[PDB]
Amino acid sequence: NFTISVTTEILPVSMTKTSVDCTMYICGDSTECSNLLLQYGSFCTQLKRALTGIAVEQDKNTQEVFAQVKQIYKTPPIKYFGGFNFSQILPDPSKPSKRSPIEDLLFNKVTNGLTVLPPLLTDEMIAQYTSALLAGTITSGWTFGAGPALQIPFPMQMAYRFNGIGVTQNVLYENQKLIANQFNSAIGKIQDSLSSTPSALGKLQDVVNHNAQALNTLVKQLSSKFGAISSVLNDILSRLDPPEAEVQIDRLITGRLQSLQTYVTQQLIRAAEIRASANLAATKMSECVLGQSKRVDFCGKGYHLMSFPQSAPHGVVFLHVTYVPAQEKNFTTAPAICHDGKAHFPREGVFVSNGTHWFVTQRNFYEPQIITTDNTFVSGNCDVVIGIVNNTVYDPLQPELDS
Amino acid sequence: KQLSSKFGAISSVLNDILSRLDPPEAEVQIDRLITGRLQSLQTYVTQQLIRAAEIRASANLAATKMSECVLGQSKRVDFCGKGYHLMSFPQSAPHGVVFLHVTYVPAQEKNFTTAPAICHDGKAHFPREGVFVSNGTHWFVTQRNFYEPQIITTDNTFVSGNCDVVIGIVNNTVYDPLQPELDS
Amino acid sequence: GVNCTEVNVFQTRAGCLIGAEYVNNSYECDIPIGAGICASYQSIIAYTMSLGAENSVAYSNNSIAIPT
Ligand SMILES: *[C@@H]1O[C@H](CO)[C@@H](O[C@@H]2O[C@H](CO)[C@@H](O)[C@H](O)[C@H]2NC(C)=O)[C@H](O)[C@H]1NC(C)=O
Ligand SMILES: *[C@@H]1O[C@H](CO)[C@@H](O[C@@H]2O[C@H](CO)[C@@H](O)[C@H](O)[C@H]2NC(C)=O)[C@H](O)[C@H]1NC(C)=O
Ligand SMILES: *[C@@H]1O[C@H](CO)[C@@H](O[C@@H]2O[C@H](CO)[C@@H](O)[C@H](O)[C@H]2NC(C)=O)[C@H](O)[C@H]1NC(C)=O
Ligand SMILES: *[C@@H]1O[C@H](CO)[C@@H](O[C@@H]2O[C@H](CO)[C@@H](O)[C@H](O)[C@H]2NC(C)=O)[C@H](O)[C@H]1NC(C)=O
Ligand SMILES: *[C@@H]1O[C@H](CO)[C@@H](O)[C@H](O)[C@H]1NC(C)=O
Ligand SMILES: *[C@@H]1O[C@H](CO)[C@@H](O)[C@H](O)[C@H]1NC(C)=O
Ligand SMILES: *[C@@H]1O[C@H](CO)[C@@H](O)[C@H](O)[C@H]1NC(C)=O
Ligand SMILES: *[C@@H]1O[C@H](CO)[C@@H](O)[C@H](O)[C@H]1NC(C)=O
Ligand SMILES: *[C@@H]1O[C@H](CO)[C@@H](O)[C@H](O)[C@H]1NC(C)=O
Ligand SMILES: *[C@@H]1O[C@H](CO)[C@@H](O)[C@H](O)[C@H]1NC(C)=O
């Protein structure tokens, strides 16, 4: 017996783009600031160029993770996909933001001179891209990330997914109601569990809190004396005498520029880490969604069947579909079957004997079939295989060549 | 270009300050100049390490694609090229590499009417590797990515179960070659 | 990010846009601005982003498509 479960794996994509007013943050409304700062060469153009490059890289990451298709597919008006309840996943038009209930739950759970830029792709367009991707991986199979989309009925696509993991498709067609009920129960369970557990949104909350704290500590550093006389421009450039005021304001702007350089270096390193995570999420979107990936523990714990992405604030969330077998059963095997002085070997599976009778079965499911010469290929003779057992093999057409 | 910055000093030439002012003030001027130039050099080195880390990540990705799309065939969907994968070649470029992925794009489709199983003689038939495709009157089994139809035979189908458990089954005959073989 | 009530003019959800008229039609993005506004030289116009053609595909219970 097999149990189908859905698991969550959350990956951030992009943080908030930032732009800094350089000479306004250093010191504003002072000609002495200008004639002391423009003689520092270029310690400001470098910072502005690096931060704008970071913003462009965040835009590129947002474009790369979600815009893997050049079409906006629309779901068919039929809501009967074969008994599967695609209502917590496929978006509905009654909501004002055109978002799925899981996206709504995830968005509701997640909660001078420094300027925060807005992203190019707003959340409505990200939700539209995810709706198009769900339409593509429901009604078109996996043959739409490679060429044009093709109509595939959903039970046959799911049978293809079972055929991808070494299990014959017929076990789907004798268990369709059970698979549909298990999938719907798993979807409802994960919908409840995304709200029941409070610490299931670590990465997105940590990245937005890190951005907020790194932006707050700069403004906190704006009001420190840095070993100078004071921390106010109108106090240091009016009460003092310019022979010492020039040195004091040079020390103060040197400290402020050092703090700004530290902030830019921290933002560069965090953006590099976010870029690596976004590349990993793009690989996940290209493999675990647009097709089946046979490698273990990259698209969910267990054998992988499909996955559905959902839009998230400052990132993406994945809902994998995994095939987890259970209900083990002990048996006695043999590497080969001996018959008439020649050995037989299984074509697709393994020779399994419960008691005094032998059967051939597929590898990941118990389906006993009578040993025929259409389930075996002969090779060599019966004196060298270690552990071979004696048993007759059914020939095909026995009662037919003499009738 | 940072050499021509005064850094709050009198000038940006070390020979000029040392040959025009007394050493008590020249010490302060050269100290400010040397700490400014040292800060500039540290900033350049930090930028170089960041860019080198990014280039290291990109070069590891390039070696990944070279080992997994030139030395062999990759079954990962949309990892090398837009479409199904065949093979690829590397070409050398200054300070980089350029691949030429060779892909397989199955355009010009034509849709049909299908069914997951065929019922005959009280038992259900399932396709071994293809899909049951009907063009309206007869039935055929064809490949999953190229429409080359073949007549249904017992040698490319496997039987399991009966006609009642599976849904969506249809009724059609199946060709068994032993019936035209036995009478001859 | 400046509400230009003190300094043709079309107001985006990114600040003020001066010198670019607004067109209700939509085209492919060339120069990104933010909040789903992209401007291109057709004069200079600013339009809502086009995500692509609405290539809807049919679906049934027994319809399959095979390339030839
Ligand atoms: C395989 O396991 C599933 C559940 O893990 C079984 O489905 C349950 O079956 C019992 C009785 O057999 C019912 O009372 C439950 O309502 C079923 N649950 C669901 C969700 O449908 C299934 O019967 C098992 N199949 C085999 C062959 O053991
Ligand atoms: C999917 O499962 C739900 C579980 O009950 C079905 O019922 C919906 O339940 C939610 C929350 O309990 C309500 O907000 C909806 O209004 C319910 N739907 C209806 C039609 O009343 C839901 O019907 C199932 N969907 C399908 C397509 O079977
Ligand atoms: C091992 O399993 C096989 C098949 O499940 C059993 O073979 C059948 O068992 C039933 C139950 O008595 C008999 O009515 C059939 O005649 C058996 N088939 C054949 C071809 O002999 C087999 O009995 C099981 N082994 C044990 C020790 O129980
Ligand atoms: C469906 O395909 C079959 C096989 O290609 C077609 O059957 C053949 O049709 C041609 C054209 O009239 C005849 O010359 C052949 O003798 C037919 N072969 C047979 C009957 O085995 C069939 O016509 C196609 N159906 C439609 C509606 O196009
Ligand atoms: C199978 O046998 C092993 C020992 O050989 C035992 O530990 C295990 O519990 C058995 N499993 C079942 C399902 O009986
Ligand atoms: C039964 O198996 C044993 C061990 O493989 C072998 O020695 C013996 O000849 C076999 N009996 C036959 C083939 O009748
Ligand atoms: C699918 O087939 C039907 C008739 O069988 C036809 O009306 C429809 O246009 C076809 N779909 C496509 C995309 O060609
Ligand atoms: C197939 O034949 C059986 C037995 O005559 C019948 O019950 C069933 O309705 C038939 N199905 C179709 C699709 O004709
Ligand atoms: C700009 O300010 C006016 C008056 O306060 C307000 O009505 C308008 O909505 C503001 N613009 C935006 C884009 O909110
Ligand atoms: C598919 O099956 C459902 C279930 O009854 C039915 O409502 C729908 O009309 C069917 N679709 C077609 C195209 O016949």
UniProtKB/Swiss-Prot annotation, chain C:
This is Spike glycoprotein. Changing residue 40 to A: No effect on O-glycosylation by host GALNT1. Main component of the anti-COVID vaccine Chadox1/AZD1222/AstraZeneca; in which the human tPA leader sequence is added in N-terminus to enhance protein secretion. Variant D614G has become the most prevalent circulating sequence in the global pandemic since April 2020. The mutation is associated with higher viral loads produced in cell culture and animal models. It would not change pathogenicity nor neutralization properties vs vaccination. May be prevalent because the mutation increases virus transmission in human population. It is found in: Virion membrane; Host endoplasmic reticulum-Golgi intermediate compartment membrane; Host cell membrane. Belongs to the betacoronaviruses spike protein family. Glycans are attached at residues 3, 24, 61. Contains sequence and structural motifs very similar to those of a bacterial superantigen and can directly bind and activate T-cell receptors. Activation of a broad T-cell repertoire may be involved in the hyperinflammatory syndrome in acute COVID disease. The KxHxx motif seems to function as an ER retrieval and binds COPI in vitro. The cytoplasmic Cys-rich domain is palmitoylated. Palmitoylated spike proteins drive the formation of localized ordered cholesterol and sphingo-lipid-rich lipid nanodomains in the early Golgi, where viral budding occurs. The chain holds residues 614 to 716 of 1273 of the full protein. Disulfide bonds join 4-16, 29-38. Changing residue 68 to I: In strain: Alpha/B.1.1.7.
